[PDB]
Design a protein around this ligand. Structure first.
Ligand code: CL
Ligand code: CL
Ligand code: CL
Ligand code: NA
Length: 129
């Protein structure tokens, strides 16, 4: 599913991401924009053999099981395919674990390089939330 911007904002808010670990909703929408372009089906292979999955590009080396990342943990205890579903629950709940692990949203490279320090509230402007 390719979410609309405000559609994704509303879903993320409903699932408790607005202000989660102190990160306002626009941070999460901005991260999803640049990680996946709001496409739940996005997958991207990394140099180390892991793959990133879903709207927040969650990595198979630590967070989900894809069966082809040797040495992987599965800290969200989910198949990586669950992170490709139209229903973002699994991605949100796994993202909550990631952002709580110590480095905050710096876990998302696109967030650090394209969202951090910017006017992230712009990403929820115009939405009825
Ligand atoms: Cl915001
Ligand atoms: Cl694996
Ligand atoms: Cl933080
Ligand atoms: Na894994």
């Amino acid at each position: 599913k390719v979410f609309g911007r405000c559609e994704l904002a509303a879903a993320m808010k409903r699932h408790g991401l607005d202000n989660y670990r102190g990160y306002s909703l626009g941070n999460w929408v901005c991260a999803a924009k640049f990680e996946s372009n709001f496409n739940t089906q996005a997958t991207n292979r990394n140099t180390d053999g892991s793959t990133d999955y879903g709207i927040l590009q969650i990595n198979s080396r630590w967070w989900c099981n894809d069966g082809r990342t040797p040495g992987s943990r599965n800290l969200c205890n989910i198949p990586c395919s669950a992170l490709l579903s139209s229903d973002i629950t699994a991605s949100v709940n796994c993202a909550k674990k990631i952002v709580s692990d110590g480095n905050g949203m710096n876990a998302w490279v696109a967030w650090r390089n394209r969202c951090k320090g910017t006017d992230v509230q712009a990403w929820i402007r115009g939405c009825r939330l």
